[PDB]
Amino acid sequence: NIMRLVTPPLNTDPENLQLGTVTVLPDSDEAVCISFAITRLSMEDLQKVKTRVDNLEYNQA
Amino acid sequence: NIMRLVTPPLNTDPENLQLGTVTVLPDSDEAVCISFAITRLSMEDLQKVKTRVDNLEYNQA
Amino acid sequence: ERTYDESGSYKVNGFELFSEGNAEDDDHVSVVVDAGKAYVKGFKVDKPVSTRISVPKSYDL
Amino acid sequence: ERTYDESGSYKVNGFELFSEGNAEDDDHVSVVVDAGKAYVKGFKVDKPVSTRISVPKSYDL
């Protein structure tokens, strides 16, 4: 599809982990690579998230 | 107790996982069933929570 | 032990409550619990088929 | 089984995407996937070195 409307394929297979997407420009060696891999959140990351929820609801008050 | 004041029993046993509550109306076949089961949050769900927090922070700014 | 100490008890999927009112006894209301999977005290609990349970009617005055 | 039930699939580290454009063929664009570690369906996938992949050029009109 045209570059304005091109989208990646849609997949819902549980057996595969999506690492990202590669876009190839029309008839050209150049290609755009982006990484959308699902990545873990350690307990330290989740404590940081909880801290940011605290800060949001402090700013709210 | 009367329907305005009835509440479910209070339990703190670690060995049991609560699935929900069943309210029975006074002297009737009818019954209201609601599920309150604690459910997991995969890494994709926690990443979505992280993104929602980022959107909340951006809206706050 | 590891599972409980990391994440505690939680539901994976299923275990929805449905009211049927089957006339097995006039002094009870039938309730159906849908098939589902959960981890209780770190032990997996996989149920392939729904389980039927009955609650006694309320006659306290 | 336990890991996939608890958290699903997720990435630990690595697996970045980089476009190199190696001239292995005039009708393909080479892409390099960096070494990483991940858990897919609960099975660990640990790769020591990068992997080269190639995408066909877009010629549809």
Which residue has 């997720």 as its token pair? D10
Q: What is the resolution of this structure in A?
A: 4.0
A14-21, long-range: CB within 8 Å, 24+ apart, which pairs?
A14/D8, A14/D9, A14/D41, A15/D40, A15/D41, A16/D40, A17/D9, A17/D10, A17/D11, A17/D38, A17/D40, A19/D11, A19/D15, A19/D17, A19/D33, A20/D15, A20/D17
Q: Which two tokens stand for residue A35?
A: 């990484």
Distance CA A37, CA D13 (A): 10
Q: Which two tokens stand for residue C2?
A: 């590891």
- Considering only CB atoms, which chain C residues are within 8 Å of D5? 12, 37, 39, 44
**Among chain B residues, CA nearest to C17:** B33
The shortest CB-CB distance from B33 to any of C9, C31, C38 is to C31
